[PDB]
Amino acid sequence: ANIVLAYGEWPEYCPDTDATAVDKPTRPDVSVNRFYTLDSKMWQENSTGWYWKFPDVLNKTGVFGQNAQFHYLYRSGFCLHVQCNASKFHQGALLVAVIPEFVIAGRGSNTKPNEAPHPGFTTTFPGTTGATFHDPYVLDSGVPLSQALIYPHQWINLRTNNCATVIVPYINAVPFDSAINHSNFGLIVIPVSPLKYSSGATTAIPITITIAPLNSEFGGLRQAVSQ
Amino acid sequence: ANIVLAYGEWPEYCPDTDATAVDKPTRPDVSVNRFYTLDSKMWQENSTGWYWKFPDVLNKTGVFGQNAQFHYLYRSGFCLHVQCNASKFHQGALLVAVIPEFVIAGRGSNTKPNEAPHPGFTTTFPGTTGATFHDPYVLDSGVPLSQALIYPHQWINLRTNNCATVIVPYINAVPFDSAINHSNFGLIVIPVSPLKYSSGATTAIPITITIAPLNSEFGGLRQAVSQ
Amino acid sequence: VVNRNGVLETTINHFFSRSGLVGVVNLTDGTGYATWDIDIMGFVQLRRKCEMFTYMRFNAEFTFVTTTKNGEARPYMLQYMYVPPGAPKPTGRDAFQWQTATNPSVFVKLTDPPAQVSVPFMSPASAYQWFYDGYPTFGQHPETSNTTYGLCPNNMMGTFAVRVVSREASQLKLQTRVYMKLKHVRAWVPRPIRSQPYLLKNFPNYDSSKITNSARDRSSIKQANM
Amino acid sequence: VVNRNGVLETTINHFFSRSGLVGVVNLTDGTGYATWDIDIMGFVQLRRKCEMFTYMRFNAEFTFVTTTKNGEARPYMLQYMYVPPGAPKPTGRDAFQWQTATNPSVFVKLTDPPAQVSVPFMSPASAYQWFYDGYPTFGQHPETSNTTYGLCPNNMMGTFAVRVVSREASQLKLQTRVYMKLKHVRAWVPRPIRSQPYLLKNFPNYDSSKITNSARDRSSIKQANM
Amino acid sequence: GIPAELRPGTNQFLTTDDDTAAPILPGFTPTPTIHIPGEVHSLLELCRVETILEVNNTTEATGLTRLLIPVSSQNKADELCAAFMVDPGRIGPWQSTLVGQICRYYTQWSGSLKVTFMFTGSFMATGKMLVAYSPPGSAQPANRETAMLGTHVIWDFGLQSSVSLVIPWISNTHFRTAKTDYYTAGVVTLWYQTNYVVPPETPGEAYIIAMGAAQDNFTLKICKDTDEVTQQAVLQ
Amino acid sequence: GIPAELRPGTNQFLTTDDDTAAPILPGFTPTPTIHIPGEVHSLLELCRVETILEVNNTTEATGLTRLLIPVSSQNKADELCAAFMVDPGRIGPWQSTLVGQICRYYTQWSGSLKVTFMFTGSFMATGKMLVAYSPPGSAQPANRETAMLGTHVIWDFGLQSSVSLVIPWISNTHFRTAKTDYYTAGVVTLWYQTNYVVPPETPGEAYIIAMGAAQDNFTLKICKDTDEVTQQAVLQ
Amino acid sequence: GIPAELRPGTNQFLTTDDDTAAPILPGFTPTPTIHIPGEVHSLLELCR
To answer: Which domain of life is it from (chains E, F) (predicted)?
Structure first.
């Protein structure tokens, strides 16, 4: 298909006039700006969807992960590539969308905040394997799925294409941030149209995610902390 | 006599800068812009008057009627011609007037709107045969007849003339309108001076109406609805 | 004769630019709120003046004068809210509608001067029209209990709600009078000025069994008494 | 078609520049003072409007409207104090905090018009954000009673205290309503507008056992009723 | 701030005040204006339009007959047909006209007036009439010899059906008050100048319609609430 | 000092007033502004983004299936698939879209609309559809022969998956009110133009996703409080 | 006189307001200023 540039802006280094912390940042730029492949997901007849919180999915893999957990401040953009292919006799559709500041809501009917339910840490920050949607219809947050087209997004329609690519810059209210404490955005994949085929067709359809962290900056060097 | 141009303005097509609905209108302009003759009325010694609500009198006759009930929006001006002749020994006078937005009032003394009397549909929208006046003195609406000379009008004085012609443009608060739901103006004919003659004179005096819809526009084409 | 008499007083703007009684709203605060459907043909003095024309386009100025039953002016806080068509109508003296976040409101004391606001021309059409010959719907339009023959849906402008801003019931019987002034006026198609007494707010009905003559009767056509 | 319809009403500044109910503070004066934590997601009408965006930067105008239980307006003096983060919180109706020497304060009568002040953009970050995906601390973040997952410490702006300036107890039950208006607004990253009912002030929780449909149900897909 | 003091007239709501008020909807753009015919800029454009007088405002006439002045053949000569007062705000025939209704909205009036008479009969009937305006000073004239000493027009029937009589505004003050003695402007009378003459096989009775209006120099002064509406409750 | 008097409108707190207030912190310098992507200058930028309609808003469908219109093979020909109203502020499918939610914040709306239909099936399936907008005047059309007399598009399946239907704003007033009779703009219908045809070893059912949006000439008028929030207490 | 209306924020005493007040002693001339060392223009000179 095409390539989506989120908000029509390329990622870039934090410039003059926009920085606050005063020390020279590091830019590895070849060993961190590369493509990483995650383990895939089995798309089945009743799968609800998956999500990944992004400045933690790569937080433990490679030179990027080592830089992230050695430095205290981080900033970069991303390139997202979701792959899923089937035969010409399969049918379905997936919505792939990038949600900045994707805050997961607790699921319960307690009106007193003291004893109200809350998601556990892993559900909020799944890591490399992601999490599955409990209620895809309300985006697991109380807001409708239908309007998630306001976010930068693509469709994988099995009769049209088999890849979805989004290029996204750095979105935050501060020029630099901690990559262990804050997840800048989440990536959601949801099958709004179910997967269908006939007997004799392959039943094992995988969905794979590959990401590239463009324009990586780290600062505030100290010992290595990851939690 | 002469010809009355209502408010000193000729009818015209809806221009640029004044239109709202965006689609090309139709202009038949030869098969709708022509003269139609209605069946006449017997003027008698105690006739009270008649009226016609005009964007429905022609709503069921000819190509104009077919266009009106096929299209949802309408706009045009009119030319009105009333005919009545008698001998040189007859006497009388008729007032012919055009009332924009001629709303017929209910006749009763009920002060609670829930159970107050109201005119039926036919009395409000008579069609091709018209309706007769119950109280010509109050114009069937609670306002005096004497001041109906504020409207564009003519007199048929049997000793002076035998025709009355009014040319009237489009009067409305919106550039286009529905011809099945809204009657833009009504035409009233009332004998303020009674008809008198002597024995041996003809007793059958008819009154006839002929109309021409100038500058016809229709829009919003769909199926044919007439109610 | 070199006449210098003056004709400026006879213009439409000077004829229509004067406040007049438009509405009266009664509150008991024993419900706790009152509502009023904005419609200005409820009082005859302004109605007769406005119905001399078919089409009228203007801005307005609304003044609110609130008092009690005895006429006292004890210091209380009142909220005036304008609820446009579609918006939810307040349901109690403490409901969630009264935290007006998009709706306009005026907080005013009973001891304050009467409140005064400006209103623009708000019609989906190009002008307000008091006479609409027709129905606002495709249908059957029954011949017995007709109604809906003079709706003019281009004239529906929402409601006005008034409440007492208080923790609980204040036990105050209030009466607020709404006065409207027309500004920047234009008019089209003059009509005869009504001679018959009014009967309904939204319909032109008149008593046919009792028709009043437009001129007072005199004894003979050869005198000059009446 | 030469369209002249007007689009100025649809801007962000005109959409957000209208006062709305933000807080309610109850005082008994039987303690002698009341406090309120400044946080404006306590009422749903302004919350739904503000949560249509991720980042928002603006100045504000705060109006205070104080009444009694019955609604009377007896003449008393009240002190409104704003206590920024870190500053000591007043402990009594006569404590040493009320001699505000660096803190801002407003002395206002119950009989006066509602008080009105201006507030700038006061965040250590570049914008206020209502959605903060993360924790404000390096730690263990337990998996049972989590909390602190949406703190956004860049949004903590201090408290508001109100007292009756008097020699002793005045025996007055007061209620002050705080209305906020946004001015000079900028916004970033629009989001879906919430469909589920709100449950908590600081969390986006929703009732999963009772999910409301975003569209009302109709009988068949071949009709056009709902 | 700026020192000031508040003057008498503070905190008053004048119904006819000309000030500004706070807008409720900022940034608002109204519906665009279209062209509508029949625009009105003053009431004086409406005072000049001719409108029927209810001269036959008696008990016997009801309905449309109140607007018809009968004219038949006489045999006593120099007879009187009709008479009415020329004050437009006074009760009587002028109450049924538009200029009268508008003059009822004001306190003082000035200028000349016009009355048009339109004859309705057969083509064969003919006659002459004397239409006389008499300024104030005495009762209504008792004969045509007295009535012809004032302003008048002699009108014969023909192809043209109507005649016009101009009442020329003979007053001492620049304005007159609509019954607010020192006012009233005189009386209009209508007399048979010769007769109503008709051939055989033709009706012996015909009608005349009168129509009243203002003139170029007409003007009004001091707006007021009219006295032709009535209030009893709040629904009407 | 300077003489003055206080006018009506004194001592009133208008929620939509445009005035000045006293600053609390003099000499204050805020945090400097950074560049953030995705800046929004008006809601009209958001009305133009396509968003899914809940057309299958029935009792049987719950969850994501409310956004899927089923399409299978017929055997009765010229059959009807779907129908819905085109008023964006009305209850129904448009309630689930962004332009509908924003239109619920205003009183009047104007301009054209757009609906995109996206076909989801196998590469081998094919067919044709008739998507018809009908302006007001009657009930929903009962057959394709009636429905094709209005505005319509004939859409065949292929490499391109979606089609667009523009609802062109045929009205008499410059604005329409979102249920505040004289409004509602007509009905959209979706009919089988030919059929749904598939080879063997392929599912016989597929889905269609509809997505609604505004147009360039769209505009809104008179802000108001929406009717999709509810208040019961003060913690939410 | 000049028509006006009074706005919210009337009759309030803001502790950090920047306005004028009426002088109590007209024509007053203070004691002349001498040169004193160690003048301070901001607290930031003392933080350093």
So the answer is: Viruses
Q: Which of A43, A21, A4 is nearest to A203 (CA)?
A: A43
- Residue of E31, E169, E222 to mutate when probing chain C, most C C-beta within 10 A: E31
Contact (CB<8Å) F121/A88? no
Q: Are D80 and D64 in contact (CB under 8 A)?
A: yes
User: A50-53 and F51-52 as β-strands: parallel, antiparallel, unpaired?
Assistant: unpaired
Among D63, G6, A141, A90, which Cα is nearest to F21's? D63
Closest by CA position to E135, among listed E188, E83, E80:
E188
Domain borders along chain A are 1-227
Sheet order of strands, E219-223 included: E176-177, E106-110, E219-223
Q: How far apart are the first and last CA of chain F?
A: 51
DSSP H or E stretch at residue C181 = strand C174-190
Question: Does residue D49 sit in helix, strand or coil?
Answer: helix
* Structural domains counted in chain C: 1
| Nearest in space to B12 (alpha carbons), one of B219, B172, B216, B178 | B216
Any idea which residue has 């981080």 for tokens?
A74
F170 shares contact with chain B (CB less than 8 Å)? yes
Residues 10-49 of E with CB under 8 A from F: 10-13, 17, 19, 21-26, 28-29, 31-32
Q: Give the chains touching B; criterion: ≥3 Cβ pairs < 8 Å.
A: C, D, E, F
Strand A4-5, strand A163-168: pairing: parallel
Residue F28, SS3?
coil
Give the pairing of strands A217-221 and A50-53: unpaired
B170 in Cβ contact with C55 (< 8 Å): no
Residues A26 and A217 sit within 8 Å (Cβ to Cβ):
yes
Which residues touch B152 (CB under 8 Å, ≥6 apart)? B4, B6, B7, B97, B98, B166, B168
**Residues of chain G with C-beta less than 8 angstroms from the C-beta of F9:** 5
Could you state, in order of their start, the residue ranges of all structural domains in chain F? 1-236
Q: How was this one solved?
A: cryo-EM
Identify from F202, F232, F236 which residue to disrupt to test chain A contact, counting A C-beta atoms within 10 A and taking the largest count. F202
Chain F residues in contact with D179 (beta carbon < 8 A):
15
Tokens of E149: 């000493």
Backbone angles phi, psi at A48, to 5 degrees: -100, -20
User: What are the residues facing A96 on neighbouring strands?
Assistant: A154, A189
Residue F109 near residue F184, CB atoms below 8 Å? no
E72: helix, strand or coil = strand
CATH topology of domain E1-236: Jelly Rolls (2.60.120)
Provide the domain limits for residue C149: 1-226
Residue D109 neighbours by CB under 8 Å, 6+ apart = D75, D76, D77, D78, G11
Contact C125 F180 (CB under 8 A): no
Spatial separation of the C-alpha atoms in residues C78 and F80, rounded to whole Å:
56
Contact assessment for residue C19 and residue C180, using Cβ atoms and an 8 Å cutoff: yes
Of A7, A89, A136, Cβ closest to residue F37 = A7
In what helix (H) or strand (E) does residue C185 lie, and over which residues does it extend?
Answer: strand C174-190
How far apart, in whole angstroms, are the C-alpha atoms of residue F216 and residue C70? 58
Selected from 1.10.760.10, 2.30.30.100, 2.60.120.20, 3.40.50.450, the CATH number assigned to the domain covering A1-227 reads 2.60.120.20
Given a contact cutoff of 8 angstroms between Cβ atoms, the answer to whether B197 and B90 are in contact is yes
CA contacts within 13 A on the Cβ side of A19: 15
**E203 near B CB under 8 A:** yes
Is D67's CB within 8 Å of C165's CB?
yes
Q: Phi then psi for F115, rounded to 5 degrees?
A: -130, 125
Min Cα separation F68/chain A (Å) = 7
**Chain E hits for C187, Cβ within 8 Å:** 39-40
Q: Which residues of D touch A19 (CB under 8 A)?
A: none
**Residue A147 dihedral angles phi and psi, to the nearest 5°:** -90, 0
